[PDB]
């Protein structure tokens, strides 16, 4: 089967054959599209096919499909599974796997960069202190004094599901949120629940607007343990505006390193429940989502008030005006401080080039339009008019529930 996508600005048509390798399910059926739904121990039996599918893909990528090395690796893994009920990836397969999970991440507009990912193998890690050390090293390597480098750190895989490695933080670096008795929130409302857990685990909260959360790290299914990232490793950018000198007095800053720490990496049927990965920001993530979402820092009113916009009616587009100025400020600040950031015009133009290249060289590029289109100025970016096909390829990154919901407490 060939599936066509059209771009409605350019009339360019592409043909997808890669979807034929799709395996997992979308949530959609012939009767219902779930395209805007955010969330729409294995057996030896199911595992060897998953292993084999992966190793066939790996060995094809290196032009060794069907080689003795390929056949021998299949035999080796087969016997490891039947004898130990799981298997270990070779380092090269781990690197390939992690790179492909990113390449396959359909919500990620930054995938042009997928082949340039530093993979840190932390499968020898045994303790939460060990995890803390690996995470500091990742942070320092990825930050690179503002010249950001993409990285992933991979902790030991799931065994029986009772010995999971987990990072309880949603991101390595994130700000605390504190619900006040009057119902207001100090800091970042997205992180209230996790902040409460940290405090219950013994963190002494500074109780300010931008407190970097401690790491809460679980090794080998044990109860998690608190660690503070050395402050000198957390690069932050104070936010100012190129023309509005009062913008700085809003007291805003953000951290430079976006590092997702709550997802599960599946490679060849193996599950890496702790696999923190990081890149660099697209400006709208800070300027649109983190600052202007109503359930986040929610700064639109204050900015608009300081700008003396007409706020009596929505039709003056005061919210749109303030939004643009905040996003200008974020890009200006990061650039002035020499911290890697990409604007949404650059990011989306690069994604479309990536996507076209993928169609030609790979036969497709699964993409989730809902997430790929930027949260402001959508239609003036080249992704808006691009038709996309969303399907799930493995290796992959997957959502997993927050660990406090599932963890069996030891005491």
Ligand X SMILES: OC[C@@H](O)[C@@H](O)[C@H](O)[C@H](O)CO
**Catalytic site residues?**
108, 111, 280, 285
Bridge partners of 192, per DSSP, are none
Number of Cβ within 10 Å of residue 300's Cβ equals 20
Bridge partners of 88, per DSSP, are none
In the list 107, 179, 289, 362, the residue contacting Cl ion (rule: CB under 5 A) is 289
Number of Cβ within 10 Å of residue 331's Cβ equals 20
Q: How far is CA 299 from CA 208, 252, 327, in A?
A: 16, 10, 12
Partner that binds at residue 117, options ligand X, ligand HEM, a second copy, none, CB closer than 5 to 8 Å by kind = ligand HEM
Q: Does residue 306 interact with Cl ion by CB under 5 A?
A: no
CA distance 308 to 323: 14
Partner that binds at residue 33, options ligand X, Cl ion, a second copy, none, CB closer than 5 to 8 Å by kind = a second copy
Q: Which of residues 250-279 bind ligand HEM (CB under 6 A)?
A: 260, 277, 279
CA atoms within 13 A on the CB side of 279: 19
- Smallest distance, ligand XFJ to C-beta of residue 166, A: 16
Number of Cβ within 10 Å of residue 24's Cβ equals 11
- Smallest distance, Zn ion to C-beta of residue 322, A: 16
Partner that binds at residue 3, options a second copy, ligand X, Zn ion, none, CB closer than 5 to 8 Å by kind = a second copy
Nearer to Cl ion, 157 or 284 (CB): 284
Partner that binds at residue 152, options ligand HEM, Zn ion, a second copy, none, CB closer than 5 to 8 Å by kind = ligand HEM
The pair of three-digit structure tokens given for residue 159, joined into one six-digit string: 């065994």
CA atoms within 13 A on the CB side of 397: 22
CA distance 77 to 56: 12
Task: State yes or no: 102 annotated in a binding site.
Answer: no
In the list 190, 237, 347, 373, the residue contacting ligand X (rule: CB under 6 A) is 190
CA atoms within 13 A on the CB side of 377: 16
CA distance 384 to 94: 34
Number of Cβ within 10 Å of residue 168's Cβ equals 24
Task: State yes or no: 184 annotated in a binding site.
Answer: no
CA distance 16 to 364: 5
Nearer to a second copy, 266 or 368 (CB): 368
Q: Does residue 379 interact with Cl ion by CB under 5 A?
A: yes
Task: State yes or no: 318 annotated in a binding site.
Answer: no
* C-alpha R_g of the chain: 23
Q: Which of residues 73-102 bind ligand HEM (CB under 6 A)?
A: 102
The pair of three-digit structure tokens given for residue 411, joined into one six-digit string: 């005491």
In the list 130, 189, 242, 375, the residue contacting Cl ion (rule: CB under 5 A) is 375
Q: Does residue 205 interact with ligand X by CB under 6 A?
A: no
Question: Cis omega (within 30 of 0) on the bond before 395?
Answer: yes
Interface with ligand X: number of residues (CB under 6 A): 8
Point out which residues bind Zn ion (CB under 5 A).
28, 33, 35, 289, 293, 379
Please say whether the beta carbons of 365 and 359 come within 8 A: yes
Binding residue ranges: 36, 108, 171, 280-281, 285, 370-371, 384, 399
Binding residue ranges for L-arginine: 171, 280-281, 285
Binding residue ranges for heme b: 108, 399
Residues that bind ligand X (CB under 6 A): 170, 190-194, 262, 402
Residues that bind ligand HEM (CB under 6 A): 102, 105, 107-110, 113, 117, 150, 152, 260, 277, 279-280, 282, 285, 289, 342, 347, 371, 397, 399
């Amino acid at each position: 089967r060939f599936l066509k996508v059209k771009n409605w600005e350019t009339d360019v048509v592409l043909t997808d054959t890669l979807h034929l390798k799709s395996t997992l399910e979308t949530g959609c059926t012939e009767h219902i599209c779930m395209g805007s739904i955010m969330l729409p121990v294995r057996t030896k039996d199911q595992l060897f096919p998953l292993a084999k599918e992966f190793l066939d893909q790996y060995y094809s990528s290196i032009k060794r499909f069907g080689s003795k090395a390929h056949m021998d690796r299949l035999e080796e893994v087969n016997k490891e599974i039947e004898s130990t009920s799981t298997y270990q990836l070779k380092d090269t397969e781990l690197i390939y796997g992690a790179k492909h999970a990113w390449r396959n991440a359909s919500r990620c507009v930054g995938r042009i960069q997928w082949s340039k990912l530093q993979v840190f193998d932390a499968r020898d890690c045994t303790t939460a202190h060990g995890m803390f050390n690996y995470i500091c090293n990742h942070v320092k390597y990825a930050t690179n004094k503002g010249n950001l480098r993409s990285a992933i750190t991979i902790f030991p895989q799931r065994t029986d599901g009772k010995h999971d490695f987990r990072v309880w933080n949603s991101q390595l670096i994130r700000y605390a949120g504190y619900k006040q008795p009057d119902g207001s929130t100090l800091g970042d409302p997205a992180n209230v629940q996790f902040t409460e857990i940290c405090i219950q685990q013994g963190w002494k909260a500074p109780r300010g607007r931008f407190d970097v959360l401690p790491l809460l790290l679980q090794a080998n299914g044990n109860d998690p343990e608190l660690f503070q990232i050395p402050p000198e490793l957390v690069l932050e950018v104070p936010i100012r505006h190129p023309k509005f000198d009062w913008f700085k007095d809003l007291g805003l800053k953000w951290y430079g390193l976006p590092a997702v720490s709550n997802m599960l990496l599946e490679i060849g049927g193996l599950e890496f429940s702790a696999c923190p990965f990081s890149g660099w920001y697209m400006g709208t993530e800070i300027g649109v989502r983190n600052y202007c979402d109503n359930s986040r820092y929610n700064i639109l009113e204050e900015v608009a008030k300081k700008m003396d916009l007409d706020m009596r009616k929505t039709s003056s587009l005061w919210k749109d005006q303030a939004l643009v100025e905040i996003n200008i400020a974020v890009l200006y600040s990061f650039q002035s401080d020499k911290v890697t950031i990409v604007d949404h015009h650059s990011a989306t133009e690069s994604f479309i080039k990536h996507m076209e290249n993928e169609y030609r060289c790979r036969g497709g590029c699964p993409a989730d339009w809902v997430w790929i289109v930027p949260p402001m100025s959508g239609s003036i970016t080249p992704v808006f008019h691009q038709e996309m096909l969303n399907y799930r390829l493995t290796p992959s990154f997957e959502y997993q529930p927050d660990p406090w919901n599932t963890h069996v407490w030891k005491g």
